[PDB]
Design a protein around this ligand. Structure first.
Ligand code: HEM
Ligand code: HEM
Lengths: 507, 507, 135
């Protein structure tokens, strides 16, 4: 009953055959009106961005271009797929309003279909492998679509795979569909009708190479067929993650790990729409190579593009090494960074998975990075209690000659810090009166830092909080049966003082 | 030495004066090139989207339109400001490459300037109040810009306010520019030259109303002056958060809360660029309405927009009640949802800050939501130890009619669960052999659930993990202190079984 | 002087028994700890090596309090003072107890004073610091 997704294609398209032989409907990429009837019309005509620093740094003689396909409605290149598939299904009459649309997804197809459903009222059921970020869940719950997860390492044909659950669901609930992104011909057709046309029109149809990731089979086949039909000289590369079976010939697939940390590319089967014959050479790329290039993309060109583009530019800085002056390289950037905010963008996760190493983290930092905070000029001869009046504090601080002081309880529990200037501004503004206690103007946000920690830790703490209260704590022993813990503020540091210290040491 | 940001405007503009009197260069928009020379050219000509369900539900007789200004490069409506200010500064010659650009910001001018700096090489320092989400800190770090935080509740005039820290830095770091978004005339001028032109051209200049947030002063003044000059009949409204001072007349500001949870609107002063007299009427909006309307925007129109796009439509569903058929309402949606993923999009945070009550989150749920999980048909008659061979397991399970079994160690620790269907596929694929132990096929991830928790908790657990292992644990006492713990797998439930139960009970 | 490896994570009260001290300092990996009264007034220092020798000599017993072996004399030094001042202090006294004192205000006149031991430095540590920094 169930239909495999890896079955060989029945398609009969072959290079050189005129489009008049196409059994499939072709949609005109007509320009959208001046007022989009709804968000779904903001899918198409994404910009073609020239990329400067990466191409120059790694010795690319040819102009390197990137097709930014992360400014679609949902933020991905799986938003042409949802629109095209829904349009075609409704046109052919296979679907009616109010139906339930099940769709196994590698990620962004889930978001695209959820958005289209929420706009047109369909009840959507998305099935995702368990490895996908939670940021692709929080953006689905808000859309209201149901979400079902499947085990990460289940082989596609087994019942627990992320297509086995989808097909079983389609049988339990009546009046439900599976648009089947793996097999539907509308998947690559969307690209063959819009993605290829836009590239050809923008680049004047004179591009001597292309790159593109894989994992659906659409972004590569749908573009390759048109490019070879109208731009025969284009060398159409591929990509794949080390651990997938899509890449050919078999020699490049000889690695064993069954899971990889790039979300959206590679698979353990050949999708039916994947027209491999159009590829001209397959590379591979591995997690760290992808993340350490996504970070540098963001940092050096402002292209806010996510993980699956790191691999796609990594492969470019190799495959195009043989190009010469006057030729153009075109790449595809599948998705926006919004789906990886807790992933590789987070230093913590990058170091935890070791795609960076600490020496890489420090080599790029100025000289003073390793100096211990103990070396700064910091002190706090005075302290204040929370019960004092603001009128009393304004005189105490000035008569002592200090502009700020910590606020501590009777025993040592730090509560916050108070500053003269803010207190005076509050008094003048009338928000508090001199008789009023300081409890209404005390700064309650701060973070402790201990003397040993390097200035690097201080600089990574000031990114969250203005005040870094240097403190020291002691355990006191009575008889091993009674003990107490105590701490005392030992001066505070702030970005102002840190930069002043760096300047003074430099000067 | 330091210059206040709230000083009265020195501008002499007044309705009806010819444009030839403008002392400021106007950057007339021109058709964008087919290949953007870099990302900074994807700033302008964002779509205009009619909004269907919100307008109809709340009795808006008029066409309600939205200007989606969250498809700019940085994902915000503060990306025209960053581009325009940098370009004008360079044109004036006040700036040279390699300089340090310090800018106090509410969070989105920060990202815009960080992008427009990392593209051109400037060393950017961004000062930002502590209240802004960490999801902007993460996106700033990747861009490599220095970041400095300031206390949340510091009065603007105090030295510890974000403007104060910005000016103190500028006064000490050599070769440093402070573009001062609050005072620069380019801030509103950018909108007056581009934002107004696009709205006028798209909407045919026949809009009888407008809405817009405030907090910078630019989005409203810049659009308002042009709309009044060329579309005199537009009824221009403002907005503001309860707790801010920008709103007029003063009678509306009589509230005492000094902090509000919307990021980027309102302030404790009147920015100089804010040309208030162009407003025709003001309102206020409070946190809960804004967040609820942001959620009900996302869930019902696919317009992915963040917190400040909630207030800007909650205000519309009131101010436009007086409109009639045939007239157009235009709103401004500042930012993209990428900056709030941990915030209101997260049910956890929403409930924690109580902007939703549990009954609100439970009313719309189907009937079975309150049933207890023990209501389901669930059992686990047998178990297997990890040391068993796959050959043994495939014969144990098939003979009894069962197809899956938990994996339990000798003591009782749950290790994982194995499915017969996946084991057979693994054997056929050659990844394992019958002599091999199950350690290579055991699913590693699952989540526990106890018999008392409702099916709602189960449905919120299945959004993260395929398997929900219904377990049970008992504490056992030998004699008082010599306690011990034990746990057993009672039954396993999956989305398939939950949906099947719902269907069977319904039928 | 703040450039040294000065530290003092723990402290003891004068009434503690010597057995408790010999066990605490060893189980915590340290060998010396300041003796601080309840109010925070520094009283002296106690060292594991001397206490163990005293136990073996019979001058004290494990149940005995540390009051009979506490070192009585020292001299305070504040973190701002140069190593020259520390060297001219160590010519008179073995222990230089680095401390910090704070005035705490309830309301102007109703003031109070507090202090704590931030670290202890001795000629051994000073010379070792010089040697390591040079090398
Ligand atoms: C000369 C033009 C074309 C010819 C002769 C052609 C022929 C066909 C035919 C007869 C089928 C139905 C096969 C079946 O139902 O068993 C088919 C399906 C399909 N075609 Fe085409 N078609 C053309 C255009 C295109 C184009 C432009 C694309 C993509 C760029 C495409 C991709 C596909 C795909 C993916 C399928 C479905 C394969 C499957 O479901 O296994 N076709 N084609
Ligand atoms: C008839 C057209 C205009 C006239 C007569 C005019 C006149 C002036 C003058 C003389 C100044 C300098 C004031 C000073 O340096 O103290 C100024 C600044 C300024 N103008 Fe215009 N200008 C025009 C166009 C515009 C437009 C189109 C905008 C916004 C849409 C604008 C907003 C501003 C702002 C924000 C300032 C800065 C005020 C300050 O920094 O204190 N002006 N204008």
């Amino acid at each position: 009953l169930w239909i495999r997704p890896d079955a060989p294609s029945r398609c009969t398209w072959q290079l050189g055959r005129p489009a008049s032989e196409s059994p499939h409907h072709h949609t005109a990429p007509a320009k959208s009106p001046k007022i989009l009837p709804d968000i779904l019309k903001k899918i198409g005509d994404t910009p073609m961005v020239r990329i400067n620093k990466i191409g120059k740094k790694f010795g690319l003689k040819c102009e390197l271009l990137a097709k930014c396909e992360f400014f679609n409605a949902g933020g991905s290149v799986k938003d042409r797929i949802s629109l095209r598939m829904i349009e075609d299904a409704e046109r052919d009459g296979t679907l009616k309003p109010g139906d339930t649309i099940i769709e196994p997804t590698s990620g962004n197809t889930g978001i695209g279909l959820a958005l289209a459903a929420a706009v047109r009222g369909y009840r959507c059921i998305i099935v995702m492998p368990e490895k996908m970020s939670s940021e692709k869940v929080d953006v689905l719950r808000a859309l209201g679509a149901e979400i079902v997860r499947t085990p990460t390492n289940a082989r596609f044909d087994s019942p627990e795979s992320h297509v086995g659950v989808a097909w079983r669901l389609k049988n339990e609930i009546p009046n439900s569909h599976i648009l089947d992104q793996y097999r539907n011909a509308s998947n690559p057709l969307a690209h063959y009708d819009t993605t290829a046309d836009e590239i050809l029109q923008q680049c004047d149809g004179k591009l001597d190479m292309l790159v593109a990731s894989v994992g659906t089979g659409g972004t590569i086949t749908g573009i390759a067929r048109k490019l070879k039909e109208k731009c025969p000289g284009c060398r159409i590369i591929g990509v794949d993650p080390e651990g997938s079976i899509l890449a050919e010939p078999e020699e490049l697939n000889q690695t064993e790990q069954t899971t990889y940390e790039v979300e959206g590319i590679g698979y353990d089967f050949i999708p039916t729409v994947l027209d491999r014959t159009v590829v001209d050479k397959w590379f591979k790329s591995n997690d760290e190579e992808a993340f350490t290039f996504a970070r540098m993309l963001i940092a050096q060109e402002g292209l806010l593009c996510g993980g699956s583009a790191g691999s796609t530019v990594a492969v470019a800085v190799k495959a195009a090494q043989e190009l010469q002056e006057g030729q153009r390289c075109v790449v595809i950037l599948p998705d926006s960074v919004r789906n990886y905010m807790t992933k590789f963008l987070s230093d913590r996760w990058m170091l935890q998975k070791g795609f960076l190493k600490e020496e890489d983290l420090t080599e790029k930092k100025p000289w003073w990075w390793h100096l211990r905070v103990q070396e700064l000029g910091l002190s706090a001869p005075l302290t204040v209690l929370p019960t004092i009046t603001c009128g009393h504090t304004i005189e105490i601080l000035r008569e002592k000659g200090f502009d700020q002081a910590p606020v501590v309880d009777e025993a040592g529990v730090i509560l916050g810090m108070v500053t003269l200037g803010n207190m005076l501004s509050s008094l003048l503004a009338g928000k508090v009166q001199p008789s009023d206690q300081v409890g209404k103007v005390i700064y309650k946000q701060f973070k402790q830092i201990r003397l040993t920690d390097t200035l690097g830790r201080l600089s990574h703490i000031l990114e969250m909080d203005h005040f870094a209260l240097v403190v020291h704590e002691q355990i006191q022993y009575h008889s091993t049966g009674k003990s107490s813990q105590r701490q005392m503020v030992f001066g505070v540091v702030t970005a102002i003082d840190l930069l002043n210290f760096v300047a003074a040491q430099e000067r």
